[PDB]
Design a protein around this ligand. Structure first.
Ligand SMILES: O=c1cc(-c2ccccc2)oc2cc(O)c(O)c(O)c12
Ligand SMILES: O=c1cc(-c2ccccc2)oc2cc(O)c(O)c(O)c12
Ligand SMILES: [Zn+2]
Ligand SMILES: [Zn+2]
Lengths: 167, 175
């Protein structure tokens, strides 16, 4: 409401940037295929933590030729990119048929979705269909047309939107 | 369990289809109990700018779009404003279902306890210790202080208990 929005944030925050959104993923083989092949993201970096039994995969809309190859240069670059998706893999969940993650849209709710802006929701979704992508909401379904939701291999919801046709 | 080799992981990566060339990662949506508390936290404490507020009286919810953007860049015309808001990179979408603020029975799940899923958003800052010193002075609740545990990396909580990572890209290459 009216007073809650600070319009003159302290200058010590002026260089803060929204660097990542982290989601836990059961199987990086499926997740990496989906985010790179279907949605066109690039894998920036894979970090492994043997002592803690997990790996991190950082994906973003970045040109792979921009990514430094030396692992130390790569690390500083990856963490200074805007809008990365951090996928956390706890070792062994792929081979654990008892295990799966919660997408936040049913009890208990919290997290809702990530969202990707695209030039053409209908063409993009037509391609998603041809690729066998699972839909939550097709662009025509529901009546808030021209907006879609698809699901990644863990069942997380991804909004597919056009900024001009939201209006 | 041993985790993927680099070779396995990279072999599951395809190059992007040219039809996705202009796709951008636009938003992360979180549900929020109290918009007064949340907007104060994200604008005043973390310095994001509220790009736009949308109200849907028929359905009894509101949306808040926040981002690290120059407030002077926001268009005045509401058609211009919506297309600009929705084409900004890395925005935070906060969804408020009306009335949750004054229901002491209600709260949202931050994803970090059973059943797990979502973990956090993360903000890169010039100096984690300086940022956290201010957070401490502003009464921010911490999950992990930078000195405690992986020094130089922190986690704080927003008013719903969502975890927010505080990191310095120039020092994270040190564990
Ligand atoms: O409920 C929503 C309604 C509208 C909307 C915006 C402009 C004109 C008409 C409808 O946009 C949205 C965008 C989102 O990213 C989202 O998660 C949403 O739930 C909505
Ligand atoms: O466990 C983590 C370890 C490291 C790390 C990075 C460089 C050198 C040493 C350790 O970075 C992280 C970054 C994140 O965004 C995150 O959610 C994490 O859990 C970690
Ligand atoms: Zn993280
Ligand atoms: Zn959304």
């Amino acid at each position: 409401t009216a007073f809650s929005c600070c319009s003159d944030p302290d200058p010590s925050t002026k260089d803060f940037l929204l660097q990542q959104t982290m989601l836990r993923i059961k199987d990086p083989k499926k997740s990496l295929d989906f985010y790179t092949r279907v949605l066109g993201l690039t894998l920036l970096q894979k970090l492994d933590f043997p002592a803690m039994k997990f790996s991190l995969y950082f994906l973003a809309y970045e040109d792979k030729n921009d990514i430094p190859k030396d692992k130390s240069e790569k690390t500083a670059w990856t963490f200074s990119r805007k809008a990365t998706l951090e996928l956390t893999h706890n070792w062994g969940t792929e081979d654990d048929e008892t295990q799966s993650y919660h997408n936040g849209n049913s009890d208990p709710r919290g997290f809702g979705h990530i969202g990707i802006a695209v030039p053409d929701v209908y063409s993009a979704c037509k391609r998603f269909e041809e690729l066998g992508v699972k839909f939550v909401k097709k662009p025509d379904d529901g009546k808030m047309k021209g907006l879609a939701f698809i699901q990644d291999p863990d069942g997380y919801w991804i909004e597919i939107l056009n900024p001009n046709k939201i209006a």
